[PDB]
Write a protein that binds this DNA or RNA. Sequence first.
DNA 1: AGCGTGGGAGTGT
DNA 2: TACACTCCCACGC
Length: 119
Amino acid sequence: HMRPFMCAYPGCNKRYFKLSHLQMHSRKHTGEKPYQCDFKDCERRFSRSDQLKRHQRRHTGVKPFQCKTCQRKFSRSDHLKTHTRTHTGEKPFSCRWPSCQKKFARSDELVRHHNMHQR
DNA sequence: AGCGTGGGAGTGT
DNA sequence: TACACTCCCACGC
Ligand SMILES: [Zn+2]
Ligand SMILES: [Zn+2]
Ligand SMILES: [Zn+2]
Ligand SMILES: [Zn+2]
């Protein structure tokens, strides 16, 4: 499980299994973002081409992922997935606090809830 | 709230 | 590198 490709940038402990992953990560320290958005004077740019393509759905308005329950359409597949939990009632994130037995559909819901517990 | 919805990131083919 | 899937974090209401 050892990651041979380690970043040598000061203060960074990132390591990867592939050289391409490390080479892509190195663009974070250099700021290189070769994939610029050319829609309607947009200033967004990305180090990865797939991040640009996902972003450009903002301009085209395309919602490729449709809920098979309520037929609502969504720009991203991960947001479709968490949306469908509003139908199924799946809540895979439990608090684990002694008295609290609340569950949540998304991890960021549980993170906000955990902030209420102390002592 | 609970949940829409974006960037950033890791990893799969 | 292209493309696809997944998860975290964040903002907003
Ligand atoms: Zn680094
Ligand atoms: Zn754009
Ligand atoms: Zn739905
Ligand atoms: Zn709790």
